[PDB]
Design a protein around this ligand. Structure first.
Ligand SMILES: [Zn+2]
Length: 31
């Protein structure tokens, strides 16, 4: 699965691109 978050500290792979969008959406700060 070519879906991995860029957050190194995160250390978690994904199966859907949408996940990273929303998950990363709150990886830091708040936005
Ligand atoms: Zn992540």
């Amino acid at each position: 699965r070519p879906f991995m978050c860029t957050w190194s500290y995160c250390g978690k792979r994904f199966t859907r691109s949408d996940e990273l969008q929303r998950h990363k959406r709150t990886h830091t700060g708040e936005k």
